[PDB]
Each structure stands twice: as structure tokens, then as C-alpha cells.
Ligand binder design. Structure first.
Ligand SMILES: Nc1ncnc2c1ncn2[C@@H]1O[C@H](COP(=O)(O)O)[C@@H](O)[C@H]1O
Lengths: 320, 49, 98, 120, 110, 55, 347, 42, 140
């Protein structure tokens, strides 16, 4: 372990690198809001690091070779099957949503660690504070049950409460007809199978639940469809902001050091994600878990720790 | 290389390895010297000379 | 021994029977703790002053100061309850049973 | 139960008279068992951190074995000194007071009566 | 017993004064006041700084009582040990004051 | 009658039933500190008078 | 949680305990006790949640009542003796008050009512500290007062503590309450033997300290607080399941493990003084302890409980926690039996 | 081992954090003359 | 309540029924009072009347257990002309178990209480005869 309390004793203070440009900015929107490139523009305007949307193989990408692991080893859920049958028997919907929330939590932990260590601000898309707007859009469409909803609420309550919200959020306002037309012109062979009621529900939860609390707990900006293209207006608006809200104001060196200690233990971040609540859409019995665990242990680069694999070509294993 | 990020345990910590080797050698020679001194004092005390 | 000694013992037993079977909030418990404080202080001072042990006059004052700081700690604990439940009642202390 | 013995020289792990005993050899079976315990501790430390058990941390395993064998040697020395004190005090108090320890006349079997209970 | 005589006389004079101030004007037949503060209906806020400075006063007074017996102690034979002890105790008071300064104690009630 | 019911009833099941019953009686506290301190008072009074542990 | 402040607080706890150990005056014993509890109060307020405040309030009230009883015993001893050496007391009331004061301090039943609650509401490091290091000082106090200890009172407290701890641990499913009741039962077990041979008491204290430290280290390493997550841990590291299985086997005194070392030898000092029914009764209650231990290992490793889906991400990250002294304390808690006469160093 | 008395004991929260379950307002009287409605935070 | 045990054991077995009966009744009453006091302290009573009802129920039940056990042991020791026999205490313990089962409105509980109380009284006689010491003074 490199960073510890000994470093903080020796003078590794995290507000030494906390300049005025170290800002946590997340951008939101609809299914095909076109924000995906816009944040990239911010990555070439304020110099901030940008992170893509947390996919299924994001945890596969961050460690090991970074290659996409097969869906049996990680996820066991596919977006194409969700677009095919949302009310399926095996419960692809809630399993996919729980896996994506876990991946987004891992992405937010990595983003917070990078911001706290390197001192450089970070731009994200659809952070963990804007994921339930998907799940509620499932429940109002009947895609899941009530037990899944309260289990997700318990998971969010035990996971979010140890973290701080981002500095500025940006929501791109794209209506339902524009979203459906953009999906039609995009050309994905499986993306038209969702009803427009799902996009309407996403927009309704966005403008009914997300904005009334992100107008209070953090800084909020709102833009229409065409105003998202004008990058200079957006960066001038975010660079001329007066931060008075949010708990980022009352952060001393001790609290940020504790946060840095907590986000550098990836087991500690995801310890409360998979609580022992037995909901038949996410629990898997002993036989399949044992089989897939023994198969994952046979994968190259994963049988031992990252510095102790002979089959991938690590030398001086006997002197460590 | 195989791992995209460099692992913290990728390279052997040579300072810690040398410290472990030196500590083992020092403790071994200290134990041997202590045993030799104690057995010499024992044979001088009880006259098994 | 002397009758004042037995009066101090009876006072300490009164503070003991008041400290255990309370009905009110934690302030009553801390007040009975201060009763124990005062009884022990008076008994130690009477013993030291009656037997002419000159050095053990260090005993009474010290016998206050340490636990006095401990008493201050108890006050902070009550403030924590006053920052959590509004009132410092002992009937609100039923969250750890389950 | 030796509260009156070590009180003359308190906080002494190994006193001077402990040097009068034969010290235990470096090939003591208990000492080798403690070295085996150190090797097992090294194996457990390699196993719990997801490392190759029989290859990784050879210097770590040697340090574990060396530290365990050192503390085992010193603890064995203290144990031998304590039991030497115990039976020396036993023999000394037996020698000093032979009125409470009479010499029993060990009678032969030619006249002592043993009751016999037949089995059938 | 003269000290207790003075205390009893003084307490009884105070009792006489409060009896004159409380029961002597009751002879008059002026009126009965039915009488049907900024505090409307809210609970009393727990301003934590007052409690903090009160317990800080308590700790400082306790070790002031520790610091007390120097005028009697100044006639002792071992003056060097006394000087070291007194200087180190006042240094402990300075260190506790410095800590109470640093950890946001003397802010918003300076 | 015997090797599946009565022999199962005499030694192990009566013991297990008594164990679980008195365990449920022991761990059925309400978490109130006042009751604990009242039980402390009763214990102290019993030890001082009804047992005479200080002779 | 300033590291300088945490280091200073831990040094204050160590200084208070060692002041209880090395002093020759009753006032310094009480000084060490007071400074120890005063500096251990912030350890149980590490996480800043109301349950910790509840637990620390109950702990402070019980420890302060015990300390006031301790001064009652000291002042009575001063009245009847006129001297302050830490040795046998000179009054039966002093011995009685001191005995239940130390029983209140150590969580001995029926004064145990704070132990399963407080340990439920504090973080696992604070629980380890309270169940491991706090028990050391009043053991020294009880060891230095053994000529004047009344036999009936300490025997009644011991048997009541063992029985109550076993029967209370028979029902709880939380790990911390099971640990608390196990600590109560072990406390009664090693206070039953004190008046006959205190070397057995010191040996059982060291063995219990090592074994409880191993258990708490494993619980902080697996980040598990209840039975269900401890069941779920078998997807993450099966070697940790094997380790918790073998040290829970050792925890119930099953040979050839280390936990069979003290209690059996405690029986070796029961029949010397012509007592036969007592080790049998405490052995039956140790069997109750082994029953809920066996329940814990059945839930943990000897079966394969159904897991969730997110374990896969937990299979992509090794344990980054500072697993300190886990292998040494695991080996010393399982394979120490052929080195039984090492207890001679505790004389 | 659930009984009637302990049938209402919920499982504890997984993070072991209790849920958390304002400001002063003053009405200064008119006793120039001014009536101030005053909001305080200490 | 230590000298009460001595007064119970001062009367020889199977000689005078009355004083053994009152000694066993007082022992049972004391035990029931301790159990009732601990039950009231730990389990909060609904009111004063229900609390003293539970206290009286426990006290009278335990006093009846003691009186029945002592009376039955004494009449069995008289009818066997053998004070030094554990059979009399076994019969008295079974009578106490039967009375406890009748009080608790049960019969299997009564039979189990017969067996266990008879074995316990037999072991009490065993300790009285052979000098078993469960609270042994430190000898070595
Ligand atoms: N409930 C959901 N249904 C479909 N896609 C989702 C859901 N939640 C998150 N996503 C992700 O969000 C992406 C859409 O964002 P984008 O197409 O980048 O604007 C999808 O391709 C998924 O990776």
C-alpha cells in the first residue's frame, strides 16, 4: 500500500494540489442526447480528464489487460436482451441495472481517487447520483417489481452516503420525438424496440426528481438540444460560477484524507453493494458460482495477484 | 507488458529485500554467538572440560 | 469507628440506591455520580485529617480532579444525545437491543 | 505461584544462574517444531495474499523461520530454567524437612493381605 | 462559631430584606394582573460553543486548582524539582491552550 | 415407537428444548439500562444479605 | 481521525494500562483505570454514528460506577489498614466491593449487561480493543489481591458468567454479540481457576487474547459483520474460509488445537484441590459454546451458501487491507499444543 | 429463535448507520420604534 | 440463606417431618423470591398488581415444591427405616417434579421434572454422604 497515514504524517496534504480548476463535473441527458462528445469538448477546454460511460466491461477494462471479458465471467447481462424482452423470466432488467450501478460506483470511486491524488478535475457522464432515473423509469413501465425497487433503494442508501456530490452538473434537454428520431437515424438494429414511453418516463423522472434536488445539493446548469453544440458558451458559463452550495465547501484535510483512504480500497467501495438480500433476479446458487469462479481462476493474468503470474511473464516472483 | 496499469508489486522492493536478508543474517549469527557463549559458560561453570 | 464515618457510608448507599433505580434522563445519573464523588471526597478527607497522614493530603484533591475530567466527558455524551434525539431520556436508549 | 522466588530479581527473562544449566541444543525437536510453525506461518501469509505459496517470498519465509526459531530458543531456555527452579526447590524443601516425609517401610508380598474377588 | 454567627446574621438580614420586598407591598389593594419575548413557539437552540467554552473553563479551573499550592510549596528544600514541575505545568497549560486554538475551538465565539 | 421417537425424546430432544427455551428467556431483554441497574441493585442486596458473601 | 491524535490516544491507553500494571499504590491503579477509559472513549466514537454514542454512554456509565465502587473499597481498606500497598485487603467488605467492582469492569455476569450491547454498536477495531486489551489490567488487579478474595463470591460469579455467556451466545446471530458472549464465557472460565493457580489464568488470558485477535482480524479483513456476509465470503477467498473454520474449531476447545490447552489444564488444577463437579459443569457449558461455534462454521465454510451477482467484480480486486499479524496469530492459535509447557514462562 | 416478545426486532442496517430521523426566529417587540422579525443561527 | 441450609441439614433424615418440612418450605420460598425479584427487575411488569401476582405465583409455586419434596423425602425415609438412602430423595424429587408439572399445567414437563429433580436430589444425598465439595477451598 503506497498512500497511507504515514504519508499524511510526512506532509502529503491533498489541498496542496487542490487549485481552483479541480472540479468534478458530470453531464446527464436522455438515451441519445448527444452529450457524449460535448463532455469531450470540455476535456479539451478546462484540461480536465474525461471518463466514458461505465459499461458492462468497465471493471474488466480497468484491471488486467483491459480486454473485454466474456459476459459469463462479468455481468451475465446483455443490453440487447433487455431491448428484446424487458419483462423476461430470467430478469435481465434489474440484473443489468444493478450491474451498471456497481460499474458506475467503481467509475466514481476511480474518478474521486484521481481527483484527490492528481489534483486534476474530472468530467463524467451519468454518475451514480443520476442512475436511479433509469430504474424508476423501469418501475413506472412495469419492467421490474417493487421488491427490486426497495432493494435498489437500500443499496443506494448504504453506498451513496459515504461520498460527496459533484461540483457542477449539466443536463441536456432533448425531447422524446428528437430522441426517437436520433435513435432512428443512428442505425442500431436493436434500439428501436423500446417504446417511447420509456424515454418519456426517463424525461419525467429527470425533470421531476433529479432537478429538484440537484438545484439544492450542487450547482446545476440546463441547456436545450442546439445549445449543447456551442462549447464556448458552456465553458464560459461553468468558468464564471459562484460555488456556495454543496458540501465541498466544508472539507478539511482530514476528511479528504479519509475519503482518499476509503476510495483506494476497491473492496471497501463495493462491500455494501452486494448485501445478502435474496432477490431471485440477482442471486445465483452455489453450483454456478463455483463453476464460474473456477473458470475465472483459470483465466490468464487472474490466477494470482498482478505481480505474481508466471504464465504472463513476470520475473523475480521468488524475490518478492 | 500485460497489465494496462503498472501493479505496485510489479517490481521487487530491493531495499526491503536487502533489509530482510540482513535481518535474517544478523539474527542467525547473533543466535549462534549467544549459543556458543552460553555453552562455554556452562562448561566453565560445571567443569565439563 | 466514629459515627460520622457511618453517616458517610449511609450517604454513599443512598447515592448508590439513587443511581441505579432512576426514572429520569441521564442528568439524574450524573447527579448521583456527583453524590458518589462528594461522599468519597469527604470520607477520604476525614480519614486523612483524623490519622495525621500528612502526605496523603495528595489523596483527596487528586480523587476529585481525574474523575472530574471524567465527569466532563459524561456531559459531552449527554450533549450527543441532545444532538440526536432532542431529549436525553433513557427510554430512548433502546436502539442497540435488536 | 512463585511470587516469592523471582521478587529478589524482578523483570529478568533469563537470570545469571540460568547460565549454570545445560543450554538446549540447536537440534532440539521442540525448536525444530517451532521452526516448522514459522514455515507454516510463511505459507499461510503467502496463501492469504493470493501468491504462489512455495515460490514467492523466499526471503519472507526465511525471516519468518529465523524469527520463530529465535523466540522459540529463548522461550525454551526460560522454560528449562523455570523447571530447574521448580525441582530444585522441591528437593531443597524435601531435604530441609524430613519429619513430614517419613521413610515408609516397604513390606514384601509374603505377608501383606490382598483381597481376592473371583470372576465367574 | 463567630464566623457562623456572622453568616446566620447576614442570611437572616437577607431574608428580612426579601420578606419586605415580597410581602410588605401585599397590604396594598392595587390590581390583579391577568396579562394575556421574541421566542414565539420554537424550541431553545443548542448553541454548542457555549457548552464547549463551559467545559473548557471546567478543565482550566481544575488544573488551576492543580497549579494552586505554589506559595506554600516555595519553602521546600528541593527547589529545582519544584521549578521544573511548575514550569512544565504552565507549559502544559500553554500546550492545551494552543490545541484549543488550533482545532477550531476559538472561532464563531472567539 | 422406540428407536425413532422415545429414544430420540429422552436424552437429546428434551435437552435441546430446555436449552432453546431458557436461551429465549435469557436473550429477551428490552435494552433498557434502568432495568439492568435495578437488577444490579437486587444482585448487590442479595449478595450482602441473602447470601452473606462478606463474612 | 488525525493520525497524530490517534497515535497519542493509543499511547495514552497503553500508558494507563501499564500504570495499572507497574504501580505499587492504589491511587495509581485508579489513575491508570481512569486514564485508560478516558482515552478509550474516542476509540468507540471513531465512525460518528448515534449507535456508537449509545454504546459509549452505556460503557462510560458502567465503568464510572465500577470506579466509584473501587474507591469505596480503597477507602474502606485505608480505614481498616492505614496503608496503601497493592496486596491482600484487610476487610471482608473491601474484598466484596472490590470483587464486584472488578466484575462490573470486566463484564462478569450478572454485571455483564453492557458487554453484548456496547460491542454491537462500535467499530470492529474498537471492539477488538475492548475485548482484548481492556481485560488485561483488572486481571492484574485480581491477581495481586488473591489472598483476600472470598472463594464463594468469585466462584458464584464465575459459574454464573460461564452459564449466562453460553446461553446468551446460543441465540444471537450477529458476529459481535456472539463474540461478546464468548468473551463473557471465557472470562468466567479463567476466573474460576484464579484462586487455585493463577498461572493457568494468565495462560488462558494470553490464549484468549491471541484467539480473539485472530477472530477480529479475520472479521475486519473480510469486512463482514453478520452471519450472512461471513457466509458470502467463500466466493472471495476460500483460504480465509479455511482459516476461520480452523480457528473456530480451536475456539471451542477441540483437540489437537490450541484452545484445548487452557481449559483442560484448568481441569488439571480442579482435581488437585478435590473439586470434580465444577469442571464437569463448565465443560458442559463449553459444549454449549462449541454448539454455537459449530453453527457458525456450518454457516461459513462446511456448506456453500448462495451468493449474489456482484461477486464477479470482487473477483477482479485483491484484498488491499493491511492484514497485519494474521498468519502468525493464526498459526499460534492452532498448532501450539505440543508446546504446552511454555506456560512455565508465565510463573 | 423467534418468540412472541422478540417478534418485532428488525435486522440492523448494513452500514450500521442510524437514519437522522433548523434556525432560530425572533419576534422583537416594539417596546424611533421598530418591530424586527429576526432570523438567527446562534 | 446459608444457615437455613445448615438448619435443614441439622435435622436427621426420617426422624421429624415437621421441621424438615418448614425448612424446605423456607428454602423454596427464598428461591422463589430471588427468581421473582430477578424476573420483575429484568422483565418490566405491566402494573403493581400484575407484578405482585407474578411474584406470589412464583413464590407459592417454589414454596409448594420445597414443602412437597421435603415431606415426601421424610415419609419415604420413615417408611424405609433408612436415612442413608438416596431412594428417599429420588422419590421426593419426583414428587416435587409432579407438583411442578401440575402447577405448570403439563405432564411431559412433569415427568421430565420428576427425572431431573430426582437425579439432582440423589446427587445432593451423594454429596451429603460421601462429602463431595463443589466449592472446594484451595488445598494445594
Ligand atoms: N436502463 C438502461 N437502458 C438502456 N441503456 C442504459 C440504461 N442505463 C444505462 N444505459 C447506458 O446508457 C447508454 C446510453 O448513453 P449514450 O448512448 O452514450 O447517450 C447505453 O448505451 C447504456 O450503456
Amino acid at each position: 500500500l503506497q498512500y497511507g497515514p504515514l504519508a499524511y504524517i510526512l506532509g502529503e496534504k491533498t489541498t496542496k494540489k487542490m487549485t481552483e480548476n479541480s472540479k468534478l463535473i458530470t453531464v446527464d441527458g436522455n438515451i441519445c442526447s448527444g452529450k457524449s462528445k460535448l463532455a469531450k469538448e470540455v476535456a479539451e477546454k478546462l484540461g480536465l480528464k474525461h471518463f466514458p460511460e461505465a459499461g458492462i466491461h468497465y471493471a474488466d477494462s480497468t484491471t488486467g489487460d483491459g480486454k473485454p471479458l466474456p459476459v459469463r465471467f462479468s455481468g451475465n447481462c446483455s443490453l440487447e436482451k433487455f431491448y428484446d424482452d424487458p419483462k423476461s423470466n430470467d430478469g435481465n432488467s434489474y440484473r443489468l441495472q444493478a450491474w451498471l450501478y456497481a460499474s458506475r460506483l467503481l467509475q466514481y470511486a476511480d474518478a474521486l481517487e484521481h481527483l484527490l491524488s492528481t489534483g486534476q478535475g474530472v468530467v463524467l457522464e451519468r454518475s451514480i447520483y443520476s442512475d436511479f432515473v433509469f430504474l424508476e423509469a423501469m418501475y413506472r413501465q412495469g419492467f421490474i417489481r417493487k421488491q427490486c425497487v426497495d432493494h435498489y433503494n437500500q443499496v443506494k442508501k448504504v453506498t451513496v452516503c459515504e461520498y460527496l456530490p459533484p461540483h457542477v452538473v449539466i443536463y441536456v434537454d432533448v425531447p422524446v420525438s428528437e430522441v426517437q428520431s436520433r435513435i432512428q437515424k443512428k442505425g442500431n438494429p436493436h434500439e428501436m424496440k423500446i417504446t417511447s414511453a420509456y424515454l418519456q418516463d426517463i424525461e419525467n423522472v429527470y425533470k421531476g426528481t433529479f432537478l429538484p434536488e440537484m438545484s439544492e445539493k450542487c450547482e446545476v446548469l440546463q441547456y436545450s438540444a442546439w445549445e449543447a453544440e456551442d462549447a464556448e458558451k458552456v465553458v464560459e458559463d461553468i468558468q464564471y460560477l459562484k460555488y456556495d452550495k454543496g458540501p465541498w465547501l466544508d472539507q478539511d484535510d482530514r476528511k479528504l484524507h479519509n475519503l482518499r483512504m476509503l476510495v483506494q480500497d476497491k473492496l471497501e467501495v463495493l462491500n455494501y453493494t452486494s448485501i445478502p438480500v435474496f432477490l431471485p433476479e440477482v442471486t445465483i446458487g452455489a453450483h454456478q458460482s463455483d463453476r464460474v469462479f473456477q473458470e475465472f481462476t483459470e483465466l490468464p493474468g487472474r490466477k494470482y495477484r498482478a505481480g505474481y503470474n508466471e504464465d504472463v511473464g513476470d520475473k523475480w516472483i521468488w524475490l518478492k | 507488458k500485460f497489465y494496462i496499469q503498472e501493479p505496485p508489486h510489479g517490481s521487487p522492493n530491493w531495499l526491503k529485500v536487502g533489509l530482510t536478508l540482513g535481518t535474517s543474517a544478523f539474527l542467525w549469527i547473533y543466535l549462534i554467538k549467544q549459543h556458543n557463549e552460553d555453552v562455554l559458560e556452562y562448561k566453565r561453570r560445571n567443569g565439563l572440560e | 469507628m466514629s459515627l460520622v464515618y457511618m453517616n458517610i457510608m449511609m450517604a454513599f448507599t443512598v447515592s448508590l440506591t439513587g443511581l441505579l433505580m432512576y426514572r429520569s434522563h441521564l442528568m439524574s445519573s450524573l447527579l448521583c455520580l456527583e453524590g458518589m464523588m462528594l461522599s468519597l471526597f469527604i470520607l477520604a478527607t476525614l480519614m486523612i485529617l483524623n490519622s495525621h497522614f500528612t502526605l496523603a493530603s495528595m489523596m483527596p484533591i487528586i480523587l476529585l480532579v481525574f474523575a472530574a475530567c471524567e465527569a466532563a466527558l459524561g456531559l459531552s455524551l449527554l450533549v450527543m444525545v441532545s444532538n440526536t434525539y432532542g431529549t436525553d431520556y433513557v427510554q430512548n436508549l433502546n436502539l442497540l437491543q435488536c | 505461584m512463585m511470587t516469592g522466588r523471582q521478587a529478589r530479581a524482578p523483570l529478568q527473562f533469563l537470570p545469571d544462574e540460568a547460565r549454570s544449566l545445560p543450554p538446549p541444543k540447536l537440534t532440539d525437536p521442540r525448536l525444530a517444531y517451532i521452526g516448522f510453525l514459522g514455515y507454516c506461518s510463511g505459507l499461510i501469509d503467502n496463501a492469504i495474499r493470493r501468491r504462489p505459496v512455495l515460490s514467492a517470498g523466499l526471503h519472507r519465509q526465511f525471516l519468518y523461520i529465523t524469527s520463530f526459531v529465535f523466540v522459540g530458543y529463548y522461550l525454551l531456555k526460560r522454560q528449562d530454567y523455570m523447571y530447574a527452579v521448580r525441582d530444585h526447590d522441591m528437593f531443597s524443601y524435601i531435604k530441609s524437612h524430613p519429619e513430614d516425609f517419613p521413610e515408609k517401610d516397604k513390606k514384601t508380598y509374603r505377608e501383606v493381605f490382598e483381597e481376592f474377588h473371583p470372576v465367574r | 462559631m463567630n464566623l457562623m454567627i456572622t453568616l446566620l446574621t447576614n442570611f437572616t438580614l437577607a431574608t428580612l430584606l426579601v420578606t419586605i420586598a415580597f410581602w410588605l407591598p401585599q397590604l396594598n389593594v392595587y390590581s390583579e394582573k391577568t396579562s394575556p419575548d421574541p421566542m414565539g413557539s420554537a424550541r431553545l437552540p443548542f448553541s454548542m460553543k457555549f457548552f464547549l467554552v463551559a467545559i473548557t473553563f471546567l478543565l482550566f479551573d481544575l488544573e488551576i486548582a492543580l497549579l494552586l499550592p505554589l506559595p506554600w510549596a516555595s519553602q521546600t528544600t528541593n527547589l529545582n524539582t519544584m521549578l521544573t514541575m511548575a514550569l512544565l505545568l504552565i507549559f502544559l497549560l500553554a500546550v492545551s491552550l494552543a490545541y484549543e486554538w488550533t482545532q477550531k475551538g476559538l472561532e464563531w465565539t472567539e | 415407537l422406540l428407536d425413532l421417537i422415545w429414544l430420540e425424546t429422552i436424552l437429546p430432544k428434551t435437552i435441546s428444548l430446555a436449552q432453546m427455551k431458557m436461551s429465549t428467556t435469557i436473550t429477551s431483554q428490552k435494552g433498557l439500562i434502568k432495568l439492568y441497574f435495578l437488577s444490579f441493585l437486587i444482585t448487590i442486596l442479595i449478595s450482602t444479605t441473602l447470601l452473606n458473601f462478606h463474612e | 481521525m488525525n493520525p497524530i491524535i490517534l497515535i497519542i490516544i493509543l499511547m495514552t491507553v497503553m500508558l494507563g494500562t501499564i500504570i495499572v500494571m507497574i504501580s505499587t499504590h492504589w491511587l495509581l491503579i485508579w489513575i491508570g483505570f481512569e486514564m485508560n477509559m478516558l482515552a478509550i472513549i474516542p476509540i468507540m466514537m471513531k465512525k460518528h454514528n448515534p449507535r456508537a454514542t449509545e454504546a459509549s454512554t452505556k460503557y462510560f456509565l458502567t465503568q464510572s460506577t465500577a470506579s466509584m465502587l473501587l474507591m469505596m473499597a480503597i477507602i474502606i481498606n485505608l480505614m481498616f489498614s492505614g496503608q496503601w500497598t497493592v496486596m491482600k485487603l484487610f476487610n471482608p467488605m473491601a474484598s466484596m466491593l472490590m470483587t464486584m467492582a472488578l466484575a462490573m469492569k470486566l463484564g462478569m455476569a450478572p454485571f455483564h449487561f453492557w458487554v453484548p450491547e456496547v460491542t454491537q454498536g462500535i467499530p470492529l477495531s474498537s471492539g477488538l480493543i475492548l475485548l482484548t486489551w481492556q481485560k488485561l489490567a483488572p486481571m492484574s488487579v485480581l491477581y495481586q489481591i488473591l489472598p483476600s478474595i472470598n472463594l464463594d463470591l468469585i466462584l458464584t460469579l464465575s459459574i454464573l458468567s460461564i452459564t449466562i455467556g453460553g446461553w446468551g451466545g446460543l441465540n444471537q446471530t450477529q458476529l459481535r454479540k456472539i463474540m461478546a458472549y464468548s468473551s463473557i464465557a471465557h472470562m468466567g472460565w479463567m476466573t474460576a481457576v484464579l484462586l487455585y493457580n493463577p498461572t493457568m489464568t494468565l495462560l488462558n488470558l494470553i490464549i484468549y487474547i491471541i484467539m480473539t485477535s485472530t477472530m477480529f482480524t479475520l472479521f475486519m479483513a473480510n469486512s463482514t459483520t453478520t452471519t450472512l456476509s461471513l457466509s458470502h465470503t467463500w466466493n472471495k477467498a476460500p483460504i480465509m474460509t479455511i482459516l476461520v473454520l480452523i480457528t473456530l474449531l480451536s475456539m471451542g476447545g477441540l483437540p489437537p488445537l490450541s484452545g484445548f490447552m487452557p481449559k483442560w489444564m484448568i481441569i488439571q488444577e480442579m482435581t488437585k484441590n478435590d473439586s470434580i463437579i465444577l469442571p464437569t459443569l463448565m465443560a458442559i457449558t463449553a459444549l454449549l459454546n462449541l454448539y454455537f461455534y459449530m453453527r457458525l462454521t456450518y454457516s461459513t465454510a462446511l456448506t456453500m451458501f448462495p451468493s449474489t451477482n456482484n461477486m464477479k467484480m470482487k473477483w477482479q480486486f485483491p484484498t488491499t487491507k493491511r492484514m497485519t499479524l494474521l498468519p502468525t496469530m493464526t498459526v499460534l492459535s492452532t498448532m501450539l499444543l505440543p508446546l504446552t509447557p511454555i506456560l512455565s514462562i508465565l510463573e | 429463535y423467534p418468540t412472541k416478545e422478540t417478534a418485532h426486532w428488525k435486522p440492523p442496517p448494513w452500514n450500521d448507520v442510524d437514519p437522522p430521523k433548523s434556525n432560530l426566529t425572533l419576534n422583537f417587540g416594539p417596546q424611533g420604534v421598530l418591530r424586527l422579525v429576526m432570523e438567527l443561527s446562534g | 440463606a446459608k444457615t437455613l441450609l445448615h438448619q435443614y441439614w441439622d435435622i436427621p433424615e426420617g426422624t421429624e417431618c415437621h421441621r424438615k418440612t418448614y425448612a424446605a418450605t423456607s428454602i423454596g420460598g427464598a428461591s422463589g423470591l430471588v427468581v421473582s425479584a430477578y424476573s420483575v427487575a429484568l422483565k418490566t411488569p405491566t402494573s403493581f398488581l400484575e407484578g405482585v401476582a407474578r411474584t406470589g405465583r412464583y413464590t407459592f409455586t417454589a414454596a409448594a415444591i420445597g414443602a412437597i419434596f421435603g415431606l415426601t423425602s421424610c415419609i419415604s425415609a420413615q417408611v424405609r427405616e433408612k436415612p442413608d438412602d438416596p431412594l428417599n430423595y429420588l422419590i421426593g424429587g419426583c414428587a416435587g417434579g409432579l407438583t411442578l408439572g401440575a402447577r405448570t399445567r403439563s405432564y411431559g414437563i412433569g415427568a421430565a421434572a420428576c427425572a431431573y429433580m430426582g437425579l439432582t436430589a440423589a446427587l445432593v444425598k451423594m454429596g451429603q454422604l460421601e462429602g463431595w465439595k463443589v466449592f472446594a477451598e484451595p488445598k494445594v
